[PDB]
């Protein structure tokens, strides 16, 4: 599909046999998702940004389902205020910038 | 044109006479510049970003070209990691996201 950014591209991915709601974001070289107790082990990693870095879990090879097309790859777990999907999964779903 | 997200989309913009790269990110609601010189008033503004809160100068109604494409919208200056190009000016340029 065509999203407009008129407003916040918001949509719903299902990981970890749960659903939610993230942004669509271009800016965010990696996926960073609100506190969710997955299993697997995980490796402790800073991410940085507008007001300084946060601290997260990093899991690696997780399956995630965005709008129907599936990805797998390194999903961030911590206490971030908005859920994002990065550009190491939107490059999976073939999303591209268009103007 | 159409950029794939396998690197960061950096392009170049002008604003106020002066060239310099930009992220286009669509997880920005806001357009934010690291610091920099800009002709006019300006009134303080507070944004926050995913680990919190900074000050930054709001310029309105800027002129500022990206990519080639005109806009002339709002443009915070301040302490941002880096140059992001956000939704209040990617709707001007006709930017969407596309899978
Ligand atoms: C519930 C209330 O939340 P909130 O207001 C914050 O909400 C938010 C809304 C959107 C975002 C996404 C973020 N956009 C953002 O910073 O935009 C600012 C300007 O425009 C305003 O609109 C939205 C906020 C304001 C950007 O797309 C992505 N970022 C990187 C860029 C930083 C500029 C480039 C380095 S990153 O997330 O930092 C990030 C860093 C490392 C990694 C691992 O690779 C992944 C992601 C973050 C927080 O609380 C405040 C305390």
Redesign the interface.
Known sequence: ??????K??LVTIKIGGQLKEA???????DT?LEEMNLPGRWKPKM????????KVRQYDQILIEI?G?KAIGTVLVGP???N?IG?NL??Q???????
């Open positions: 599909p065509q999203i407009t950014l008129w916040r591209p942004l669509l974001d271009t800016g965010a070289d960073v991410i940085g940004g507008i007001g300084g870095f946060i709008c097309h971030t205020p908005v994002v550009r939107l490059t779903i073939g999303c591209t910038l268009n103007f």
